Amino acid sequence: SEVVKVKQASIPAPGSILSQPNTEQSPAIVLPFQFEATTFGTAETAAQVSLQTADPITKLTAPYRHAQIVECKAILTPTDLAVSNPLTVYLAWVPANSPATPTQILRVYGGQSFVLGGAISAAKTIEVPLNLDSVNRMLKDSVTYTDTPKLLAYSRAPTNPSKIPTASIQISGRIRLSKPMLIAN
Amino acid sequence: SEVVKVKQASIPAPGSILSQPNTEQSPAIVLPFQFEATTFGTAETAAQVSLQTADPITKLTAPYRHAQIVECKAILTPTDLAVSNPLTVYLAWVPANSPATPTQILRVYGGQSFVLGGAISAAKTIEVPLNLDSVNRMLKDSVTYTDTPKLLAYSRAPTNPSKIPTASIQISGRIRLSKPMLIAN
Amino acid sequence: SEVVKVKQASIPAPGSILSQPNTEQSPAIVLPFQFEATTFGTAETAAQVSLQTADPITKLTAPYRHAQIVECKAILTPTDLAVSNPLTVYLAWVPANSPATPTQILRVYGGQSFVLGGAISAAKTIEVPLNLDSVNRMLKDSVTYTDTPKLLAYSRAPTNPSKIPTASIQISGRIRLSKPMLIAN
Amino acid sequence: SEVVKVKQASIPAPGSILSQPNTEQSPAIVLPFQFEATTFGTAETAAQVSLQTADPITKLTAPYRHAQIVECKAILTPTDLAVSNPLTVYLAWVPANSPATPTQILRVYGGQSFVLGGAISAAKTIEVPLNLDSVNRMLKDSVTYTDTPKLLAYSRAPTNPSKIPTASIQISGRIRLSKPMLIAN
Amino acid sequence: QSPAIVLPFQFEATTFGTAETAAQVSLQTADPITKLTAPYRHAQIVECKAILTPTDLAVSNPLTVYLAWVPANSPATPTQILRVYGGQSFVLGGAISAAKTIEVPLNLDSVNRMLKDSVTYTDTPKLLAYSRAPTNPSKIPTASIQISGRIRLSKPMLIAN
Amino acid sequence: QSPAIVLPFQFEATTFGTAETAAQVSLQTADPITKLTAPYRHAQIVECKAILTPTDLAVSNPLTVYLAWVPANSPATPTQILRVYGGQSFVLGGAISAAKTIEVPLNLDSVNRMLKDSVTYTDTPKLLAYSRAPTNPSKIPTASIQISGRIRLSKPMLIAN
Amino acid sequence: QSPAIVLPFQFEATTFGTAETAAQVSLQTADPITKLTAPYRHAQIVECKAILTPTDLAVSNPLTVYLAWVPANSPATPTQILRVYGGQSFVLGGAISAAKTIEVPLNLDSVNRMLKDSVTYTDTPKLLAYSRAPTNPSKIPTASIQISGRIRLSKPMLIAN
C-alpha cells in the first residue's frame, strides 16, 4: 500500500564469470548497502549511475578482491514538494557497455516512466529491482568486466526549479565480499 | 535498519470483477512501474492518487485492454531537509469510491501517522503496501470498475516552507497486462 | 456500510520481552479502555500518542505492575461538520522508539491517508487496528520497554477553522493486568 | 491500530425473559443500527442513554412486539479538535434500574476513564462493547423489563467550550425484531 | 535467530595532542553506530577493536596514550586505565609504526553485545582513553583512536523513507 | 593440467642510495619475467621472494629500506609500506649480514598466481619499495632488491624461431 | 563437609615509606579476618593473595619492597625474604604500573588452610614484608600491601546478637 514493486523487462544476458571457486571455499561475508543515486527537481537530471564505480559501493568493496551482488534495487522516493510540483522519472537497468543514454530511455527494452509528482495520484515509493540475470553479478573481480549493472535515469528540466529536491532514487541491496586485499590502514 | 515496512490494517473487501469465456484467451506479460506521487516540503499537501486514472500506470496499459495489478506498495521518503525540519504524514489506501478525503485520513480504519525526520531514528524509508483484498485489482478491463485502489495522503501546512521537497511518496509495483489491443501502427 | 476497517500494512517486529520464573505466579483480569486521543477541526493537528505514558491506560495499570495490551485499535470519527468542511487525516502505528514524526507519516511503510467528509461516501467511522507483532505488547512490566505502541496522526492546517472539532480519533482496546502491587489503603 | 476494543467489567446478571417460544418458530429478522448517543466539548456533558427509549432504536422497533439485542457496543470518537483540547470521558454500561448517576461513574464496578483529547496520545477510536449477560437482552417485549441496558457517560465542563463537538459516542449493533405490531401506516 | 545481516563500521572516536584528553566513548550512543543501526530495532556486536594511530607530528612531540574497554557501568574513569584489567599504555613517538598497528580488541565476554533492543542494557562497551596534558599543544592532532568492527542487524524499524 | 615445465628466474628490480627511491615493480610486466614467458601462453608463479642485499658502502652511509607485496590493485603506495599488512622496515648499515640474508616472501594467497593467460588479470604481484632521499647520495648503489622464484609454463606460443 | 559458605575479604596489612618497615603479618590474628570469622567456629582459606600497590609518590622517592609467604613457624625473618623460597623483590619507582598489578599468591601446600578450629594450628599463613629505611621519609605512605582472598566458614558460633 505504501510501497509498490514493479519489475522491469525479462531477457537473459548472464554475462561471464571467473571459475576460481574450483576446490576453494574461501570465507565470504554479506553486507547490505544503500546510497543516494540522484536527486530530482533542482534542474534537468539525467545521470547514469554505474554500480561498479559509485563511491559508496566502492569504499564498501575497497578491502576486497571479489565483490558479488546478491540482490539490488532502485527506489523512487517522492517528497511533499512533489505533491504540488509533478514530475516524471525514467528508470532502466542496463549493463554498463550499452550505448543507451539517459535521454533515450523509453527506446530500450524495459524503460519505464513514472509520474511521482501526482497531485491526484497517491504519494507512494516505487521500487524497481535489478534483474541480475540481465547483467553481470560481479562488481569487482580479478578481471574487469563490461556487463556491470548501470542505472539509467532521467527527467526533463523542471518548470518551477526548486532548491530542495522533489524526488530521489536510492539504490540498496546486498553484496558478497571475499578474498581480502592488502591496503593501507 | 534502513527500510521499515509497516503494513496497513484492513478487512477483506475483494470487489467482484467480470468473468472471461471458456474460449481461446491469451498469455500475458508482467511489467513493473514506479512513479512519483506527491511532494511535501512546499505547502499543505493533501493529495489523492487513484492509479487507474493517473498515468503512467496508464501509458503502460494503453496498448492492452486488460490490466491487473499484481502487487503494489506506497513508499515514503524523507530527505536531508527533514532531518531538522520535521513534518508529519498521513497514509491510507482506500477504494476509489470512498467518501474519505485527505484531511480525514485518521478517521478511516487503518489510517496511519508517520512523523518523518526530526525524531531520533527518523529519516528512514517507510513502506506501506496495498492489501489486494481491500480493493479491486482491475485497473483496466472491458468495463470500468469503481473500487480500484486509491492512495490518499496528507500533511499539515509547513511552518518553514522549503523551495525543495522535504519528503516524497512514490508508488511501486507490477501489472499483468494481457489481451493486446489493435491500434494504428 | 457504517463502519469500515482498513488494516495497516506491516512486518513482524515482535520486540523481545522479559521472562518470568518457574515459580508461583498469578491469574489476571482483563479490563477494557477507550479514551479520546486527538481532535481535528481546530488547527493544524500533529499529535502522537504513546499509550504507555498517556493515561488513562495508566490510571488503569497503576495498581498492578504487569500490563499487557491484548488487542487495540485506533478509531477515526467524522462529524456532521466535516460533511461540507472536508479534511484529510494521516494514521500510522509506530514503535515508540521510532524517528518518524507526525508530518512524515506518509514516508513510513504503512502510512495511510484518509479523506474524511466532503467526498461521496465519506462520514463513516474508519478503524485502523494495531498489529501486535509490529510493536511490543508490554505497557508496564518490571522494566521499561522502548518499542511500545505509539499512534501518530496528522492533518494539514484547516482553511476554515471550526470552534468545535470536525473529526476525532479515539483508541479502544483491552489490557491484561496481573500481579497486583502493594500500596497504601 | 486505528480501532481499539476495551471490555468492561465481568459479572453475570442475565435478567429474566418470556418463555413464549414454546412450540413457536415465528419468523424474525435481524437489523443493524447505529446512532449518536451524545456529544462532548460544547459544555458539561453527563447524559444517560437508555437503549429501550432512545428514539433511533424506537422507530426501528416501532412496528414490532419483540425486539431483542444480538450485539451492541459504544464507540468513543475523538476529532481533530480534541488533538489540542484534551478531555476525559467516562463510560459504563449498566441496567436501567441501577441508582448510578453519570457524575459517579468510577464508583460502579466497570466504570472506565479515557483521555481522548491526547495531544501526545494517538487519536484512535475506542470501542466499549456491552456485555449482554450483565443486563437484559430484550428491548421491547409483551412485558416491560427493568434490566434494560443503559449507557452512563460523563465529562467535566470544558475549559475552552467549543461550538463544535470534540468527541462523540456512537452506539451500534444488531437487533432481532419479530411478531409485528399493527400500527398506522 | 531471524533474517539478520552483518555489516562493518569504523569511525574515529578521539583525538590527542590538542590538550589533556580524557574522554570515554560509549558505543551505544556514538553517532556513527547510530545512523548505522537506526533502520533496525536489534543491534548486536559481532566484532570490535580500537586502533590507535599516531602521525608524523608524534616524532616531534611524543605522547603516551591509555586505552581500556569497560562495561560502561564500571566506576573506572580515564585516569585509572592502568588499574583496570586489560588497560594499556603506548608510547607514540618516533612512532615509525614497526609494520603492524596498535590494536586493542574488545573482549566480548567483558560486556554486552546488545547495542539496541527492546530494553536499554547498562553493561555495553565503553572505551576509556586518556593522555596527560601535552607539554606544548598543537592545533593539529598528534594521534587518534578509531573504533571498528562488525554489527548484526535485524527486526526492520519503521523510519522516514 | 597439461604438459608444463617449471623453471626459475631471478632479476634485480630496484637500487637504493642514488636518490630518494620509491619504486613499485609489477611482476606481470617486468622484462626479465617477460623474455622468460614469451614462448608460452600460460605462466603461473609457483614460488616468489624479494631479497634485499646491501653493500659495503652501507656501513658508511646507512639507509632504511621498506618492502611490501601487493595485489597491484591496491591503492597502497610506496610511502605507506608500513601501513600495509606485511610491510617491513630494515636498517641496512654496518650491515655485516649476520649469516642469513634479508628475505621477504610473497604470500600467494594475497595475490594472483597467473602472470600470463587468455585474460589479463588485475590482482597480480607488485613489489612496493621505498627509502627516503639519502642524506648525501652516491653514484654507486648502496643496496638492491632482487626478485627470485619459480614459474610454471604451458601452452606453447608461436614466436619467431 | 557441612553447611558452609565462602565469602571474600581484603584488608591492607602494611605501609611503606614512613620508615624502615619490616613487618610480618599473620592471617590467623589479623583483625579484619577476625571480625570476619567471629560468627563461625571453622575457617578455612580457599584462596589468598598479597597485592603490592605503589603511589604517585613512588616516582619521586623509589623504594624496593620484599614479600614472602611463610608457615609462621618458619624461623625466617623479614631481612631474609630473599633467602626464602618464593620470596621476591620489586622496584616501585616511576611505577607507571605497566597494565597488571604486582600480585604474590600464597601457595596453599606451603601452609595450613585452617585459620580457626577446635585446636590452634601453628603452621598458618604469615606474610613477610621488608624494605630498608627510606633515604628521606614521608608522612604519607609511598606504597602498601593488601591481603585478599576467600574464606570458607561453617559451624555457627554463639555470639552476642
Curated annotation (Swiss-Prot), chains E, F, G:
Function: Self-assembles to form a T=3 icosahedral capsid composed of 180 copies of the capsid protein. The capsid encapsulates the single-stranded RNA genome.
Gene Ontology annotations for the cellular component aspect, listed alphabetically: T=3 icosahedral viral capsid
Primary location group: virion
Pfam families per the UniProt record, alphabetical: Tymo_coat (PF00983)
Entry similarity comment: Belongs to the tymoviruses capsid protein family.
MF-aspect GO terms: structural molecule activity
Keyword Ribosomal protein in annotation: no
Localisation per UniProt entry: Virion
Domain of life (superkingdom): Viruses
UniProt-listed InterPro entries: Tymo_coat, Viral_coat
Keywords: Capsid protein, T=3 icosahedral capsid protein, Virion
Entry protein name: Capsid protein
Organism: Physalis mottle virus (PhMV)
